[PDB]
């Protein structure tokens, strides 16, 4: 009945009411509307490094959704350099308690949609999708790349393009949760993103 511009590329704000916690105010920018599940949006919220998947129009936790008129920037950066980081295993330095710089092994997956000066990155010990302006880490010397790496993703078993196909995650407690493959990483074709129904995060998996 209607064909319209979607909200990908727009700035948004909305309340977030969950459990018994008080209401917070979220602001972010919509990166993608998932083709295989168009109720699902991928959002980078401000002040949150982890990328969220939310059914913005259906999720009861999302209150008074509003599209902001604010425009998204296209910052000046070394493009070839940015491209050269894609697919690289890295050692990413973070600040640890109590005074200890920590090295997190990670894998740069892609330049993010919409905010293309930011990078999709996941970590071996924390295999969900994160987003940073990595060139500022690399310039500050907090990003060492590992040209010859042995990187481990969590494994997804099969049983033929997988995006759009459903999964179950069988937990150690014997319970299961449902999800679906929403993305195949262009630079790393055996690596996929999965969204579980019961969880906000975007999970990064590899195929055998």
């Amino acid at each position: 009945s209607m064909t319209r511009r979607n909200i990908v590329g727009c700035r948004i704000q909305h309340g977030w009411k969950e459990g018994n916690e008080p209401v917070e105010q979220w602001k972010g920018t919509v990166l993608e509307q998932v083709s295989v599940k168009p109720t699902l949006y991928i959002i980078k919220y401000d002040g949150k490094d982890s990328v969220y998947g939310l059914e913005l129009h259906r999720d009861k936790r999302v209150l008074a959704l509003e599209i902001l008129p604010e425009r998204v920037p296209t910052p000046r950066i070394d493009s070839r350099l940015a491209d050269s980081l894609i697919g690289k295993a890295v050692e990413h330095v973070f600040e640890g308690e109590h005074g200890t710089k920590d090295e997190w092994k990670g894998m740069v997956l892609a330049r993010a949609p919409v905010m293309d000066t930011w990078f999709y990155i996941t970590y071996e010990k924390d295999p969900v999708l994160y987003m940073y302006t990595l060139l500022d880490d690399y310039k500050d010397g907090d990003l060492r790349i590992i040209p010859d790496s042995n990187y481990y993703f969590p494994t997804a078993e099969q049983e033929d393009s997988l995006v759009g196909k459903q999964v179950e995650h069988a937990k150690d407690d014997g319970s299961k949760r449902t999800g679906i493959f929403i993305h195949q990483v262009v630079a790393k074709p055996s690596v996929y993103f999965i969204k579980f129904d019961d969880d906000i995060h975007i999970y990064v998996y590899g195929l055998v």
Partner: peptide, 6 residues
């Protein structure tokens, strides 16, 4: 240098 959040 980045802070790691929960």
């Amino acid at each position: 240098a980045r802070t790691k959040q929960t």
